[PDB]
Subunit: 284 residues, 2 copies
């Protein structure tokens, strides 16, 4: 069904966990993200600029962070947040599973490193989107191509196969893929989304797919799509010294706020966002 919380934290990396441990000062808090917290932490080899942990390996620091949240009774809700609608005094939070409401939101999604595909921006809203399940009814009986950058994208492909006339899945990571037989896996490199007034084809290095929709599925939609009305410049969510965005009650912390992309900056921002959000909840 629906569940209400005082604070929702969108991301489970350094920034979101820093927010969570500072918000547990009560005030219900929910943290959305991945079971493994942050993929970048796991991939980091030796870390020498996180003060107090000289020479730690990324996966070791990840475990220290996991034990911290576990000691404080903080769990990660393992769902993808698709859209956050600023209703004015609260936020409606749409996810890959259930819908939530929260009084305050802390954006902590990190920063996407991969570039958009050619034609992606051009056809946005004319056949390109960032949430396949959200737009699924629009593609009933149509051809849909999903360019998947994470495992959740596979679930969206499976769902779309129940409505679309044909589903192609283009993986952008190496794994076994848990897809129903109706999904055609296209192990090729996307080149360009093309069309006249709307999407007509996805061109790949060795193949072209006639398709009505192309969904580009990453850990998070671009922030201005995830949070309609949010002020972003240069792909960075713009915040002030209190980590406040342009949307009252919506904060942002970590790589999603701009450079430098470092752990200490991220945890500091998460702390500031959470303490300010809590203050606003007690002052109304």
């Amino acid at each position: 069904h629906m569940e209400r919380y005082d604070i929702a934290i969108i991301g489970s990396g350094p920034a979101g966990l820093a927010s969570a441990i500072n918000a547990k000062t009560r005030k219900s808090v929910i943290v959305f993200g991945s079971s493994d917290l942050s993929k970048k932490l796991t991939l980091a080899p030796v870390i020498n600029n996180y003060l107090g942990f000289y020479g730690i390996r990324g996966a070791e620091l990840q475990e220290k962070f996991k034990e911290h949240i576990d000691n404080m009774g903080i769990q990660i809700e393992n769902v993808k947040v698709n859209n956050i609608y600023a209703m004015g005094e609260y936020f409606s939070i749409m996810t890959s599973k259930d819908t939530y409401e929260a009084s305050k939101v802390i954006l902590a999604m990190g920063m996407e490193h991969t570039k958009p595909l050619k034609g992606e921006d051009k056809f946005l809203g004319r056949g390109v989107g960032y949430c396949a399940t959200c737009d699924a009814p629009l593609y009933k009986g149509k051809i849909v191509t999903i360019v998947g950058y994470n495992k959740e994208a596979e679930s969206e492909a499976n769902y779309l196969a129940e409505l679309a006339s044909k589903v192609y899945y283009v993986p952008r990571y190496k794994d076994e893929y848990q897809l129903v037989s109706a999904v055609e896996i296209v192990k090729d490199v996307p080149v360009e989304i093309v069309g006249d007034k709307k999407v007509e084809k996805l061109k790949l290095k060795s193949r072209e797919l006639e398709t009505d929709g192309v969904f580009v599925l990453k850990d998070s939609a671009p922030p201005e799509q995830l949070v309609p009305g949010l002020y972003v410049e240069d792909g960075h969510i713009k915040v002030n010294r209190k980590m406040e965005t342009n949307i009252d009650g919506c904060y942002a912390a970590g790589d999603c706020t701009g450079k430098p992309y470092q752990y200490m900056k991220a945890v500091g921002e998460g702390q500031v966002a959470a303490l300010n959000a809590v203050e606003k909840l007690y002052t109304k």
Copy 2:
């Protein structure tokens, strides 16, 4: 004599150490402060909001920070910084011992918690000051009272006893005091600095001292006195998202920049300041 460095960090607490470990990316760096890093860290009992160190004691976290800087060959220069003069393209740094020049400065002095004495602001520049050794020639053959909040203040009293006709030392901490016999220790509580056009007396709870100067000696002068021309509001050094102050080449990080006074905020700010300072050194 004088020594030149690319970056000078003013403070050895969480913020300054975070700056130091991020600036050692070369670029000579000098860190001014106390041997014990930060007094607040030592006094902190259990810390649960420093991500990755759940349940750590303050002195334990202090030791982790000490081992980090030691592993990176970062030493603390154990002197008090008295004044930083923005010369335009560099900074002249006056200390309780030698003078330094630095291309970039990172202010990391923390935030003073004790309030000013009554009359302190009123007589500033008319008998009240924050550096006794700096103003010592002005008090040759005059009466000087030092209200000392740290051990360095004792050294300043000893120096002033060579020039002033009479030196009183009013300690604001419990310890043995290493003072020459010419210094009179006044174990009483300051109440008010009084005078007409200039300082004439220090009133204490049980005694009044006729005095020509009153020096209030804390770990650092107020930031607008430490750094002439620095923009401060509400006792907080005002910085932007890059930790830049109003003075080009001068950054600030940690409690000295405003609330919340927390460790994660401080280390994040120190990191941002240092990485920006380094960038400016490589771009000129």
